[PDB]
Amino acid sequence: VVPPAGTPWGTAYDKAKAALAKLNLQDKVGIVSGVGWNGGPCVGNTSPASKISYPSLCLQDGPLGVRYSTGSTAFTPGVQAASTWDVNLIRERGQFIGEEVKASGIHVILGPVAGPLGKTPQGGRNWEGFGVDPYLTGIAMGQTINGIQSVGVQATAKHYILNEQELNRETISSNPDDRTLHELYTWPFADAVQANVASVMCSYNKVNTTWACEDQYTLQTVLKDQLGFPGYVMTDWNAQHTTVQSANSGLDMSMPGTDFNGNNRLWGPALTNAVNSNQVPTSRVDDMVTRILAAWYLTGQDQAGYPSFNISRNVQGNHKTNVRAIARDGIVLLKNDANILPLKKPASIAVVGSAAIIGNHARNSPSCNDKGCDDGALGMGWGSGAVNYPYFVAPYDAINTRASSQGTQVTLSNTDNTSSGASAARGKDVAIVFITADSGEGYITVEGNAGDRNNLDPWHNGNALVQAVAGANSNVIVVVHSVGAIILEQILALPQVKAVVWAGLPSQESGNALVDVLWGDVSPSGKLVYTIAKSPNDYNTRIVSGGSDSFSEGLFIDYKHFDDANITPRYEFGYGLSYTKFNYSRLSVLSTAKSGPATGAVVPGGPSDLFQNVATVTVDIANSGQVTGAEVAQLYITYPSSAPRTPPKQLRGFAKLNLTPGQSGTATFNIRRRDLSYWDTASQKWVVPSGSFGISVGASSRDIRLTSTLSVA
Ligand SMILES: *[C@@H]1O[C@H](CO)[C@@H](O)[C@H](O)[C@H]1NC(C)=O
Ligand SMILES: *[C@@H]1O[C@H](CO)[C@@H](O)[C@H](O)[C@H]1NC(C)=O
Numbered sequence: 001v002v003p004p005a006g007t008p009w010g011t012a013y014d015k016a017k018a019a020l021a022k023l024n025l026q027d028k029v030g031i032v033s034g035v036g037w038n039g040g041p042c043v044g045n046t047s048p049a050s051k052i053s054y055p056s057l058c059l060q061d062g063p064l065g066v067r068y069s070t071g072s073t074a075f076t077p078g079v080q081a082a083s084t085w086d087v088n089l090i091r092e093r094g095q096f097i098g099e100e101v102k103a104s105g106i107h108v109i110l111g112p113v114a115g116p117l118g119k120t121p122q123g124g125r126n127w128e129g130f131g132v133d134p135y136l137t138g139i140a141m142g143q144t145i146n147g148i149q150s151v152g153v154q155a156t157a158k159h160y161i162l163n164e165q166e167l168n169r170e171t172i173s174s175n176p177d178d179r180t181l182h183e184l185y186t187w188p189f190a191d192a193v194q195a196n197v198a199s200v201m202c203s204y205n206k207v208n209t210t211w212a213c214e215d216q217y218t219l220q221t222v223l224k225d226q227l228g229f230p231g232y233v234m235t236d237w238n239a240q241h242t243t244v245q246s247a248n249s250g251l252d253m254s255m256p257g258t259d260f261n262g263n264n265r266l267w268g269p270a271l272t273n274a275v276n277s278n279q280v281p282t283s284r285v286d287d288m289v290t291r292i293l294a295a296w297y298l299t300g301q302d303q304a305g306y307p308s309f310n311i312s313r314n315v316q317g318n319h320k321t322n323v324r325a326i327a328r329d330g331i332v333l334l335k336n337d338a339n340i341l342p343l344k345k346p347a348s349i350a351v352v353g354s355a356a357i358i359g360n361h362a363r364n365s366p367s368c369n370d371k372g373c374d375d376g377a378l379g380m381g382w383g384s385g386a387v388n389y390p391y392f393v394a395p396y397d398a399i400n401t402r403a404s405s406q407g408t409q410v411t412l413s414n415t416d417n418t419s420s421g422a423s424a425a426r427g428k429d430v431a432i433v434f435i436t437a438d439s440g441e442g443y444i445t446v447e448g449n450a451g452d453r454n455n456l457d458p459w460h461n462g463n464a465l466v467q468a469v470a471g472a473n474s475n476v477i478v479v480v481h482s483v484g485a486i487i488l489e490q491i492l493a494l495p496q497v498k499a500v501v502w503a504g505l506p507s508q509e510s511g512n513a514l515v516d517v518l519w520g521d522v523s524p525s526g527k528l529v530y531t532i533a534k535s536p537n538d539y540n541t542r543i544v545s546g547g548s549d550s551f552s553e554g555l556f557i558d559y560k561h562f563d564d565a566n567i568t569p570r571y572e573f574g575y576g577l578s579y580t581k582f583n584y585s586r587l588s589v590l591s592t593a594k595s596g597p598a599t600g601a602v603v604p605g606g607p608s609d610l611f612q613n614v615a616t617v618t619v620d621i622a623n624s625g626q627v628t629g630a631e632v633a634q635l636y637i638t639y640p641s642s643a644p645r646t647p648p649k650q651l652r653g654f655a656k657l658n659l660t661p662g663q664s665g666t667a668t669f670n671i672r673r674r675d676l677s678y679w680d681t682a683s684q685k686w687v688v689p690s691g692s693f694g695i696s697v698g699a700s701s702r703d704i705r706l707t708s709t710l711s712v713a
């Protein structure tokens with residue numbers, strides 16, 4: 001119900017309560033009600049309350065940087081950050097974003113994304129998030145939020161909840177069972193709350209026939225009471241449907257205030273009328289304002305000297321180091337046959353594909369608003385989560401500069417013409433072919449793709465381009481920039497394809513980061529955060545075309561389905577090649593963990609014991625090969641078989657270690673009570689089952705190097 005004394009939120013509440021006492025109803029209605037779609041200078045705005053020096057709250061997109069700004073960095077999308085498996089870069093990314101958001105005079109950044117989590121590879125906005133795994137996405141959420149808010153900026157965990165597809169997102173009902181709702185999809189929102197996230201945004205879709213922004217169970221019972229969330233719930237943009245029920249269900253903020261056309265103003269004067277007509281109690285509005293002002297006080301935004309709103313300010317500083325680092329360390333090397341990579345002093349190189357050069361995407365062209373195009377090199381998906389590039393380093397330009405510097409002749413075919421490609425590739429030492437797939441928010445249809453992807457094939461005749469290049473050249477490196485999984489079986493069926501580089505979504509540092517890896521200045525060290533299957537039919541979920549997604553797969557999404565259904569993916573979750581090898585030894589498991597329901601009083605995150613450490617798993621990792629490289633060690637836990645049906649393996653830890661040849665290091669996985677828990681629907685509690693837990697540590701969800709047990713009496 002209420003945050004405890006002597007904690008950041010507790011002090012914010014005291015402050016918030018003192019402010020609330022100086023306000024009248026109009027003051028209060030102005031704090032919770034957006035001024036209207038594009039009614040203010042920001043993406044979202046509310047009305048100031050001078051009596052407590054409360055500004056018009058300025059809310060701006062999005063998860064990867066400042067939208068509409070002309071002096072901001074384009075950070076990598078979240079999926080790329082997750083792909084680094086590096087908590088330091090992830091936290092640094094949130095911090096840098098936070099610095100830019102404050103420097104621009106925005107109070108609330110609308111991100112990061114824990115929903116969609118990303119159960120379907122076709123999902124158009126999955127790339128804004130952190131991969132398909134609740135644990136990793138949770139850790140990322142917490143690190144990104146810690147980073148953002150340490151600057152004194154309010155973060156917004158979105159989208160709550162079960163917005164797993166773009167098609168009919170405003171009408172579809174997501175209908176999973178209670179365990180699935182809590183244990184899979186809500187999980188990462190709990191990390192966000194526990195990170196003291198200031199705000200949560202409710203989604204467009206329905207949850208069991210009830211619009212997410214009108215849903216008392218998810219908003220009040222789960223988020224506020226069970227997760228102990230002390231901040232405010234805002235709507236997604238015009239995701240509000242009623243005046244009264246929205247308010248009474250636990251909605252706190254109407255965004256942006258009207259629909260796109262200026263209609264459907266459900267709060268403002270209509271909320272004033274509902275309170276006056278006794279349809280919404282004053283205590284409810286008092287609660288909304290406490291939550292909103294508490295977030296303001298929590299982040300220190302009440303102190304004099306917060307920058308004024310201005311998105312023309314150059315706020316970039318040297319933040320490109322993060323984008324470079326994540327674009328670089330997030331590249332996943334999938335295939336490296338005959339050790340063709342890293343490249344060394346070839347006489348010639350062909351570079352082939354429209355995705356190698358600057359196009360309308362990189363240019364912020366008027367043909368590509370909200371990044372609604374895959375034209376030229378690709379840095380991110382489309383929609384509200386895209387931003388302007390301050391610059392963009394194309395793969396061709398970077399490759400050309402590095403290659404020319406060593407007397408390597410570069411030949412370019414800058415289109416997707418199969419015949420021009422083969423011609424450029426013929427006779428060259430290597431040919432690097434660039435393919436893409438794109439997607440985004442479901443209000444833009446790009447090349448026939450309505451938001452979600454139509455299929456899992458490369459865009460722009462990508463498969464044919466590679467086949468034509470392979471017909472002309474024995475040594476083909478395929479570089480892929482993509483919003484998600486592509487089936488690569490056709491490309492892999494070509495014996496001429498010796499290397500596959502899953503470069504992900506690099507933003508502005510595309511070319512530099514790729515050159516870093518291709519030439520082996522750094523070994524690639526990113527690993528997959530979703531499964532690349534051998535067949536589109538091997539995935540168990542789809543973009544649903546009807547009014548209902550029953551979520552009948554339950555807990556078994558992505559790799560959990562693959563493990564459960566004994567399907568061999570092409571490249572499994574947690575998979576990544578390196579230019580070196582790593583040996584794992586000496587697995588230990590230290591545990592004090594006791595069985596039963598969690599027993600702590602509810603605080604932000606849930607019962608106070610859920611995020612406390614109960615165990616520690618430790619392994620040694622040595623670099624046994626010939627070159628320096630970082631390894632991503634992963635922990636998977638198997639629950640007792642006596643426990644309610646659970647996936648066979650669940651990611652419960654990861655560590656990243658840079659090792660020079662012969663160097664040895666420690667990977668430590670701290671285990672929180674919740675990491676050994678499942679959600680019990682009947683008691684509405686997290687429970688640790690008694691029995692022997694399987695402990696699996698390795699280089700991927702399939703590449704398990706050592707095993708042990710964790711026993712709970
Ligand atoms: C609705 O949600 C409840 C609780 O989350 C779940 O157990 C139930 O199966 C769902 N009902 C339908 C008809 O999908
Ligand atoms: C906004 O910032 C730009 C760049 O720093 C500056 O030139 C301009 O004066 C600012 N605009 C306002 C209205 O303060």
Ligand SMILES: OC[C@H]1O[C@@H](O)[C@H](O)[C@@H](O)[C@@H]1O
Binds near residue numbers: 043110237384
């Ligand atoms: O741009 C404001 C909001 O618009 C909505 O359409 C998106 O779903 C949100 O992610 C976004 O924050």
